[PDB]
């Protein structure tokens, strides 16, 4: 009893402050990034959508993404899987992840009841190439192991 | 004896129904789309090459792809490896995923020999941006976990 | 104690030979290409780059890369991790994958002090679609497995 599960999630973005789908304040792991706005129908949580995304693939199932994150932890409890770990990467021009992300890591540990030690997370730039080097779009791929209890 | 197995596809598509490389009838986890065409080689099926890719990769291995696939079932078999599970990302403009999702499952489960429970599969836009974004290209990253027989 | 490890890395080339960044004579698996250049700070490894990333991630932490590969290995043993397998996908126009395939995975191997046969090493071309597409990048995903000893 162990499982693979793997997430994506792309926005586009723009870099001004902002002021189905609008601009707002880029949310990215449950930390907001005022400088940056993103074109989403929720908040546009490209971590907490492709890490959600992650942990129903692992368990074969299916505006604030903390939610998703929640229930996530409910629904992984109910089907009587724990995680092992999760690994996460950024792929954006902007914004740099390494000044928020203890941060991320910590409203992710916190989230789904693991311990910091069990989250990765790490930002890529696109080396200026394409809409996601442009500064026009962010990604995130999430990967997740599973382990049955007990 | 635990693995991990990973795979990638892409294919150029045009939205017409059809009428090395030609453009033809969509296929995709084994699904005709009749109102896409695809520019292939074989039939351009990105969830069935991408998960081949990733049960070879997981054994550390290399038209109609159905074929590879089944063959794929037998070299797990002759190395002497379970799968686990697998979960697939379509990231494609067209088609939506969601109408035949419970068919490519179903294709899926049936050709290697495994239920429906240990298939994910999601579709993820690419928000319009870029060649995928804009029509003219699906790919697909396929995971697999392999367990040793027994 | 099983761990998911994942990594990414992309580059900006030209086909031209050679003669923070500039354009120099592509390595990539450790092998050099010297038909292409590279746009990089460091020798540009994508495929070193993204396996130290995914071994890194699979146990929680963050010029010549062959020297980051090394340390990984030290950095497993210090946490007591083993590998059970990693499986590599390069995205790329050129260069072409299968003539520099054997060399690649022997100093995978060699570096990381595993078998040939836990490596596993896949080259997918773009379709000639984007900067990928258009000689103008290269990338990589790589994942990893690990292992708790003992
Ligand atoms: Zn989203
Ligand atoms: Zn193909
Ligand atoms: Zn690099």
């Not at 693979?4 to 609008?22: A, C, N, T």
């Not at 492709?50 to 409910?74: E, I, Q, T, W």
């Amino acid at each position: 009893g162990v499982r693979i599960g793997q997430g994506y999630d792309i926005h586009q973005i723009r870099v001004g402050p902002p002021e189905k789908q609008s601009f707002k304040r880029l949310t990215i792991g449950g930390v907001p990034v005022e400088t940056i706005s993103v074109l989403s129908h929720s908040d546009g949580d490209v971590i907490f959508h492709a890490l959600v995304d992650a942990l129903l693939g692992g368990m074969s199932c299916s505006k604030n993404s903390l939610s998703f994150l929640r229930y996530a932890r409910l629904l992984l409890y109910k089907r009587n899987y724990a995680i092992a770990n999760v690994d996460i990467i950024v792929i954006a021009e902007v914004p740099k992840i390494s000044p928020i992300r203890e941060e991320i890591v910590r409203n992710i540990s916190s989230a789904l009841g693991i311990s910091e030690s069990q989250v990765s997370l790490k930002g890529k730039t696109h080396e200026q190439l394409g809409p996601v080097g442009q500064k026009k779009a962010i990604e995130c791929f999430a990967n997740a192991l599973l382990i049955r209890k007990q």
